[PDB]
Amino acid sequence: GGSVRHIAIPAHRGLITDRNGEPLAVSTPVTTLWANPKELMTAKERWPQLAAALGQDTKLFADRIEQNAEREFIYLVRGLTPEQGEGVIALKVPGVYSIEEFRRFYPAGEVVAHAVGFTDVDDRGREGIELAFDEWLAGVPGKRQVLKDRRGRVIKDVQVTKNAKPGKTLALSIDLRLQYLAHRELRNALLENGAKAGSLVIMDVKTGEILAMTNQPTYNPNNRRNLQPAAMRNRAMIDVFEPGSTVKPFSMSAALASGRWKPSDIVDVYPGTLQIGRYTIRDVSRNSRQLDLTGILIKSSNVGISKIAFDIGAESIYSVMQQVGLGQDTGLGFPGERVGNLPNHRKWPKAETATLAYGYGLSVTAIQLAHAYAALANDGKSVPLSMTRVDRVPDGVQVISPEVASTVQGMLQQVVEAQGGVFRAQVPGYHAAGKSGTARKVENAYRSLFAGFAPATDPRIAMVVVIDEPSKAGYFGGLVSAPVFSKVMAGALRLMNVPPDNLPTEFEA
Ligand SMILES: *C(=O)[C@@H](NC(=O)/C(=N\OC(C)(C)C(=O)O)c1csc(N)n1)[C@@H]1N=C(C(=O)O)C(=C)CS1
């Protein structure tokens, strides 16, 4: 008797590690109890003890078997241990079977949840890297021939028709050591400032690798019960924000490349406002008259960068921001990753020219902002982004001339180190460079920004800190986000064994 059939052989999903082999997503065995209701219907006397062993009410269990009597497979319980999936088998109930199946476990939990994502109950990638690289990780199921009786019970294992092929190991660009550091410090900053959310991205300016990518709020992917959908957002890639003052270095790059501006050139920003018809550009610090181009960045003068933009024209500024990737497709293919928006016009009036120049009305992601600062730090050369470990670095694209990029770098080192600058971004033992931003959202709500890189002498790491809606008295990016940059950069440089470059001169010793 019986009918010849073919069942599948599940394939083992590939391991995801960090760049150094630390496990991030591992498919490990769990014991699962299943039943063939067609066989169970022949052993009704065994049902009550089976229900009791499974923690089910006898009536509800009997009803469930009756309501599935025409199926040949139902799950009884999933995710037990081999010891537990034997105490039920010890009842020797016909139609009850125990199997070992592989299910994802995430050893770092909430720390890398947004990057890694997760799989569904069938071990298929559903979010994050698990989805983006599902074909790589999934493998290919096998198949084997069986003989099944009239109730669907496998009577004979005949022969394997096709072997299963396991999925492939995938090493991410993430450095788990930096990820933990970034995760902890971003969390600390949210509580320090009573903020609603935040992101922090760390990039290797030489290889394009995303070394760390963390957000708050986050979630435990090992316990996705009653989860908030907002807690699962990889904000660094799928949320957009106005970068504000953090794009002024790119406006400055266009100014320097125009041949009309040098760093020691002077702009008059008195009295701290500039009327453009019915629109008024305003500075926070309004006790300045003449400022040089570095002072414009140190004071973060919207007036100053606006007058420069009028002189060189918006088109030159738009082109730099486009070339460094702001509002442009990263090409990475992360699920839900946003392109943002760099607004364009046929003709640029003064209002649109100024707002472009100081980052108002633009939409970027944290990844884009970090990649743009990586290109600035890398002497103007943009190495393509990667979420996976890069062994052979692809050729970069020269997006800012090396001379202009070097000059802007030095200016941003002064933003961090000069008198009146963003001193909380200073990294002990190293020269650091960057730019703060503070964006008013549409009571006033704010987004606090800092973007930078280090060491200034030979840049290695670019970093972006975004703090969404700090609720304490402090909200400027130089107060809220810069100290996070300092702590995380200091730890990252130490972990990567980068030599300290802030050493005394011969006369300052
Ligand atoms: C750069 O980001 C500048 N920011 C702004 O002009 C914006 N808002 O300014 C404040 C004072 C927060 C306002 O309430 O108007 C802005 C840009 S895009 C958007 N939606 N709002 C200057 N940046 C800093 C800094 O962090 O370095 C300052 C100290 C002065 S404002």
Numbering used by the authors: 1 to 244, 245A, 246 to 442, 451 to 517
Give the published text.
We report studies on the reaction of cefiderocol and the related cephalosporins ceftazidime and cefepime with Pseudomonas aeruginosa PBP3, including inhibition measurements, protein observed mass spectrometry, and X-ray crystallography. PBP3 transpeptidases are proposed to be key targets for the cephalosporins and most other β-lactam antibiotics. Inhibition of PBP3 elicits transcription of genes involved in the SOS response, ultimately leading to cell cycle arrest. Consequently, PBP3 is one of the most validated and clinically important antibacterial targets.
The cephalosporin cefiderocol (Fetroja©), which was developed by Shionogi, is a pioneering example of a ‘Trojan horse’ class antibiotic: its C3′ linked catechol group acts as a siderophore enabling it to efficiently enter Gram-negative cells via the iron/siderophore transport system. The three cephalosporins form analogous 3-exomethylene products with P. aeruginosa PBP3 following elimination of the C3′ side chain. pIC50 and kinact/Ki measurements with isolated PBP3 imply ceftazidime and cefiderocol react less efficiently than cefepime and, in particular, meropenem with P. aeruginosa PBP3. The C7 oxime linked carboxylic acids of cefiderocol/ceftazidime bind identically, directly interacting with the guanidino group of Arg440, being positioned to form two salt bridges (∼2.6–3.4 Å). The C7 aminothiazole moiety appears to form identical interactions in both the cefepime and cefiderocol/ceftazidime structures. The aminothiazole amine NH2 forms hydrogen bonds with both the side chain carbonyl oxygen of Glu242 (∼3.1–3.6 Å) and the backbone carbonyl oxygen of Arg440 (∼2.8–2.9 Å). With the cephalosporin complex structures, the C7 amide oxygen is positioned to interact via a hydrogen bond with the side chain amide NH2 of Asn302 (∼2.8–3.0 Å). With cefiderocol, a small amount of cefiderocol modified PBP3 was observed, however, most of the observed complex was meropenem modified PBP3. The kinact/Ki of cefepime was slightly less than that of meropenem (9600 and 11 000 M−1 s−1, respectively), whilst the kinact/Ki values of cefiderocol and ceftazidime were similar and substantially lower (3000 and 3400 M−1 s−1, respectively). Given that the siderophore group of cefiderocol is lost on reaction with PBP3, it is also of interest to explore whether this affects resistance, including by using analogues of cefiderocol where such loss cannot occur.
